[PDB]
Design a protein around this ligand. Structure first.
Ligand SMILES: CSc1cc(C(=O)N2CCC(c3cccc(CN)c3)CC2)cc([Si](C)(C)O[Si](C)(C)c2cc(SC)cc(C(=O)N3CCC(c4cccc(CN)c4)CC3)c2)c1
Ligand SMILES: CSc1cc(C(=O)N2CCC(c3cccc(CN)c3)CC2)cc([Si](C)(C)O[Si](C)(C)c2cc(SC)cc(C(=O)N3CCC(c4cccc(CN)c4)CC3)c2)c1
Lengths: 243, 243, 243, 243
């Protein structure tokens, strides 16, 4: 997370950390708990190549990475079948846990948006995670969960920005319709935040608008953060995740 | 080049090395001389973001990088306006030299196929360059130009290979019609060979079939080298480059 | 610590971590609390070149680095004036804290041997720290304090081992009289354990025999861990540190 | 080499490159040819641990590293028996080739000094090699041999400089009598130059005064280059090398 601050303990009870087995169970991506037995993340975190489930664990909301881990194994990885890269799109995946988790005030699910929410500019939205705090700059020990409030920008404006300084033709769309843009040169998500939630407070309720997907670097001029737009994927999600 | 050998000095007289200004004029990509004043390369070598022309140079056929350079300035970079990443396609670009080269025995142009050329599956073709000799293993000093023989394959087969051990749906296309595949777990192009030529000798004439574009790593199981298919962009190339 | 395990929280109440200012207060060396206001460490951790006192802090006994630090400022660094490199010797230093620590169950001083103490060859001693778990392999998060049991050996034996597979003449001394050796190919101190304590329980009392100083790598054949011999510098230590 | 320039072809016909076997025969140190079958280098290049001769080669004077190698194997490594580290001293070694080399105007031996030469300040002296051109900055391709003219400074002045900014006691000698000091903040030897020659022109004849040994970094204030003083080691050399 570029900018923002350490999250209070009482916030974002749905944030998860994904871990891969190596010299230690290392954090490589975020996620969100959307049901007691399902985690929502980015496909590029766990694909497009098939991975060994045994080498994967999930860790539920922790204030500091690694310090009080209780790692949960995963029975299934479902990756959106149109996923190949994040720039093409469908950067979205589901992790099914081997057991349903017990929920509490500090660990519980996030609400998905109804299909028709657009998340226009000026909505209040936060992104969270344990990624880099700037380009090629890791989150320091003790690895506190960070949050940063990020401005949403309309897709056609974001797409036009991405064309600035580029050879790509103006009519060749960069930012796709299944994506959402947010952030600026002070406030952004970054590497290690992928797969985590962008959430907005609508009519009193926190809703997941996006999954951290990609960008050109982190907090660079005219290159805002790109997120998988969750509304585009609700039917796919509900094919696997009970309501 | 993975699984290759050093090229004899009489061969590949069209090969070029692209150089970027830092502590020295470092090689970052290959190219091919297709006209006395024009180099054909990959877009991803030089875009999608516009970079400074003064920081770029071209080096013509050389047995050993850096030893006896004669570096040529570039007057123009033309990047296909559809390019944004290699996986989406249109990974092709032209460099116009400030001067025509005085062509010779050691240096000369490669012939581009006619639009109708069907390079048959299995045809033995050659890819050349100064890239990595395996995954994350750089070509050692003294940086001899390498060559490797690689069998062309049908896009349908290469697509189906990319889908083995992958979550991507089988009907979702990974290898596209503007691409061409070649190579296997012993023979392949690699990082720093990008932009460089895949050539096939067809009824006795060396034709450029492909531009080194991308892959999942180098020489991995079921992940052949992917090349921009030259016949596909013939008209765009001829829009700028004289016959 | 190589070939060790995580220390129980009741043990090694004298262990300290030295911290240097960068992007965070990074651990670079261990130390031992030998008086409420004094830390014993290795000179090479802080010299031979004079560095800024404000960039240094001390952290007292902690189960996991970084998690719940309470960092203590240092009012003075005293480096043995004979020190220039560990191989020459006099690798020993004192840090005077700005304040006496309020000693307790969890935090307290280690006892230094009397000048006459002959720690016998073979005696089982313990070395503790947050250093590397093998050559060029850093202690993983969450950075638990480790311990390992290491047999003391006679300098004459350790010297002769250092000379095996070496050009150094057999009469030319490598391990010196102000040094003490311990460890084997399974058990040893390592990089980042430097300055930290080698302790032996002698007729029921934990005495500090050594300061982690140097070695040829960690846990290599015929290259035991070398430690500054505490009895040797007792008078210098007592020149500054009250009984 | 820090400062100075690429050496003309016609100079330093006695410079050698030492190579270790890995992905390629990589340069790790210099040396000088002092007899057709003997090379003079620094012990720390090839010790103090016994190394496998088969993994070692010597390369005689080359204008550019790697480009026209003819590597020679070594039958014997003789390391000064008092060597353990460079700061202790006796940083000197001999490589015996399996065959005597043929000498020419471009490849031939350097003259050793008579025992009584002191090489006082103001003598004109050059150091040569293929090392780093500044701290942690490698010599770029095409790796030209560099030279730099360096001022000699008297041992007691150099030793006093090394004490400046240090904890080490003023009467604890840092720069030993078997060493020689040369260089300043613009002109110095560096990592990869070790084992190579410092040579001075005395009464018309080029003489090797030093072997590149150590220092604190390269071209830092008050930290000039330190060399093994060849006059101290002439009897040892002549025990092995015919006159
Ligand atoms: C199977 S597709 C694929 C393959 C590879 C791969 O294996 N490669 C590349 C191809 C190479 C090659 C070359 C020549 C020949 C051959 C044939 N054998 C192969 C071998 C090695 C690598 C990638 Si990759 C994931 C490494 O893409 Si890019 C680093 C070039 C990339 C592309 C883009 S598009 C503008 C942005 C960024 C980038 O800036 N990132 C990634 C996203 C990060 C991020 C994360 C989270 C949030 C945000 C928003 N602030 C940003 C920031 C850093 C990075 C993709
Ligand atoms: C002012 S004295 C000095 C200076 C430098 C330094 O600045 N250098 C080296 C010389 C270079 C140079 C070359 C040519 C010319 C010039 C002149 N311009 C300079 C410049 C860079 C470096 C050192 Si240094 C600390 C980097 O010594 Si060594 C890496 C060669 C070394 C020497 C020895 S002696 C056998 C062992 C190890 C080693 O294996 N270690 C260190 C100890 C560690 C350790 C720590 C704790 C416990 C244990 C026990 N298992 C082991 C393990 C790794 C390492 C010391």
């Amino acid at each position: 997370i570029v900018g923002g601050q350490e999250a209070p303990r009482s916030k974002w009870p749905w944030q998860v950390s994904l871990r891969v087995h190596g010299p230690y169970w290392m954090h490589f991506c975020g996620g969100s708990l959307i049901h007691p037995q399902w985690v929502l993340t980015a496909a590029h975190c766990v694909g497009p190549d098939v991975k060994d489930l045994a080498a994967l664990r999930v860790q539920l909301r922790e204030q500091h990475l690694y310090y009080q881990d209780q790692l949960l194994p995963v029975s299934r990885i479902i990756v959106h079948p149109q996923f190949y890269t994040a720039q093409i799109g469908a950067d979205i995946a589901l992790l099914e846990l081997e057991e349903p988790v017990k929920v509490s005030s500090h660990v519980h699910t996030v609400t998905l948006p109804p299909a028709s929410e657009t998340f226009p500019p000026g909505m209040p939205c936060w992104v969270t995670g344990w990624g880099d705090v700037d380009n090629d700059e890791r989150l320091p020990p003790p690895f506190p969960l960070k949050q940063v409030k990020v401005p949403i920008m309309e897709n056609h404006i974001c797409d036009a920005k991405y064309h600035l300084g580029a050879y790509t033709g103006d009519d060749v769309r960069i930012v796709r319709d299944d994506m959402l843009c947010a952030g600026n040169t002070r406030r952004d998500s970054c590497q290690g935040d992928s797969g985590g939630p962008l959430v907005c407070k609508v009519n009193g309720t926190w809703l997941q608008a996006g999954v951290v997907s990609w960008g050109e670097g982190c907090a660079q001029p005219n290159r805002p953060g790109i997120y998988t737009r969750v509304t585009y994927y609700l039917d796919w999600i509900h094919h696997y995740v009970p309501k």
